[PDB]
Amino acid sequence: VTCNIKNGRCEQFCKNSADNKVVCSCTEGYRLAENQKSCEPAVPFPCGRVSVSQ
Amino acid sequence: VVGGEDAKPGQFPWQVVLNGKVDAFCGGSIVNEKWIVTAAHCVETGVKITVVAGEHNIEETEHTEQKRNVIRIIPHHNYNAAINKYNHDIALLELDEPLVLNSYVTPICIADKEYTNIFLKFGSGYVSGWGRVFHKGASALVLQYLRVPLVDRATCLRSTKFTIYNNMFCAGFHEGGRDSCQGDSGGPHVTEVEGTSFLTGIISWGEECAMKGKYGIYTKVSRYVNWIKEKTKLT
Ligand SMILES: Cc1ccc2c(c1)c(-c1nnn[nH]1)c1n2C[C@@](NC(=O)c2ccc(-n3cnnc3)cc2Cl)(c2ccccc2)CC1
Ligand code: NA
């Protein structure tokens, strides 16, 4: 489990941490989710998201 | 954009259009409620520029448009049009009043330098704009978009007599028929990462749009991320 392999399963950003683990993170306006990998919106209109029905 | 498709309303909610003596002379992207990122050559001779966010059809009034005036222009400190109009071709526009963020007016994400460069390495980005829909043809009415693949440096250098520096990249198709064009400059080249778009380039310049053997030239945003984040920070 490293950031070099599938981005450490992090949805956005990955950082290598102690004991062969990774720490995921997200851009501004997102929160790291309870699953420790996903990025959830933490503001009404977070960046880079399409919210109008396509 | 030549060989693109009509965007749906709200599909590129970070896209802005710059209007001056002619409409849709360039594009831009929303950094945040007060700041737009564009190409420096779009705004070098500072005429009265109007920014329109939430735009879709530049000939119709659709209720999602937010028009703003530009109070400050910040070209990159290395930008020098007397040397080269197209090198370090990036600039920031400060708006007079903040935009009201919504589903049609949303910022583009900007990663750190390292991740911006990784996202560019994915090899496929989306470009959008109201630029010409054929080489020397009419401007688009409805916002156009196109997915463009990254083109290797050597191929890019062979394609043009002009110099391409390491803070720029090429993208396009070897067969022609699909590319950015005049009026798209300053707009976004974005990479989608699990449903979230990140700014990976600025549409810079091109020659015979969409001619076989030619490619669109882009500013690598990774080189300027720290400068963008510092200059546009609201706190
Ligand atoms: C994305 C894209 C894509 C294409 C775009 C442009 C933008 C622009 C442009 N953008 N802003 N201002 N002009 C032009 N065009 C097409 C146009 N290009 C130029 O004249 C041109 C020529 C040289 C250079 N250049 C020189 N040294 N570095 C760059 C840049 C351009 Cl834009 C042209 C070239 C050959 C024959 C006809 C026309 C005219 C101007
Ligand atoms: Na409109």
Closest CA to B98 of B55, B65, B58, B69: B69
Asked if B195's CB is within 8 angstroms of A47's CB, the reply is no
Contact (Cβ atoms closer than 8 angstroms) between residue B148 and residue B179:
yes
Q: What is d(CA B203, CA B33) in angstroms, rounded to the nearest whole number?
A: 21
Nearest to A51 among B103, B110, B193 (CB): B103
Name the CA radius of gyration of chain B, rounded. Answer: 16
For B140, residues 6+ apart whose C-beta sits below 8 A from its C-beta are B1, B24, B58, B129, B130, B131, B132, B133, B183
Q: Is B208 in the pocket of ligand 1 (CB under 6 A)?
A: yes
- Biggest CA–CA distance in chain A, Å, is 43
* Three-state helix/strand/coil letters over chain B: CECCEECCCCCCCCEEEEECCCCCCEEEEEEECCEEEECHHHCCCCCCCEEEECCCECCCCCCCCEEEEEEEEEECCCCECCCECCCCCCEEEEECCCCCCECCECCCECCCHHHHHHHHHCCEEEEEECCECCCCCCECCECEEEEEEEECHHHHHHCCCCCCCCCEEEECCCCCCCECCCCCCCCEEEEEECCEEEEEEEEEECCCCCCCCCCEEEEEHHHHHHHHHHHHCCC
User: Coil, helix or strand for A7?
Assistant: helix
For B116, residues 6+ apart whose C-beta sits below 8 A from its C-beta are B110, B198, B199, B200, B221, B222, B225
Inform me whether the C-beta atom of residue A18 falls under 8 Å from chain B C-beta atoms. Answer: no
> Angle, nearest 10°, between helix axes B113-121 and B225-232?
130
Q: Is B203 in the pocket of ligand 1 (CB under 6 A)?
A: yes
Q: Which residue spans within A1-54 are E strands per DSSP?
A: 13-17, 21-25, 30-32, 39-41
Is B6 part of the annotated catalytic residue set?
no
Is 2.40.10.10 the CATH classification of the domain at B13-107+223-235? yes
The CATH classification of domain B1-12+108-222, taken from the options 3.30.420.40, 2.40.10.10, 1.20.120.430, 2.40.50.100: 2.40.10.10
Contact (Cβ atoms closer than 8 angstroms) between residue A42 and residue A30:
yes
- Biggest CA–CA distance in chain B, Å, is 47
What ranges do the domains of chain A cover? 1-54
Cross-strand pairs, A31: A40
At how many Å resolution was this determined? Answer: 1.8
- Do domains B1-12+108-222 and B13-107+223-235 share one topology? The answer is yes
| Ligand at shortest distance from the CA of B54 | 2
- Chain A residues within an 8 Å CB radius of B112: 13
Per CATH, the homologous superfamily of domain A1-54 is Laminin (2.10.25.10)
What ranges do the domains of chain B cover? 1-12+108-222, 13-107+223-235
CA of B137 to the centre of ligand 2 (A): 21
CA of B50 to the centre of ligand 2 (A): 14
CA of B192 to the centre of ligand 1 (A): 27
Q: What is d(CA B71, CA B94) in angstroms, rounded to the nearest whole number?
A: 6
Q: What is d(CA B204, CA B102) in angstroms, rounded to the nearest whole number?
A: 28
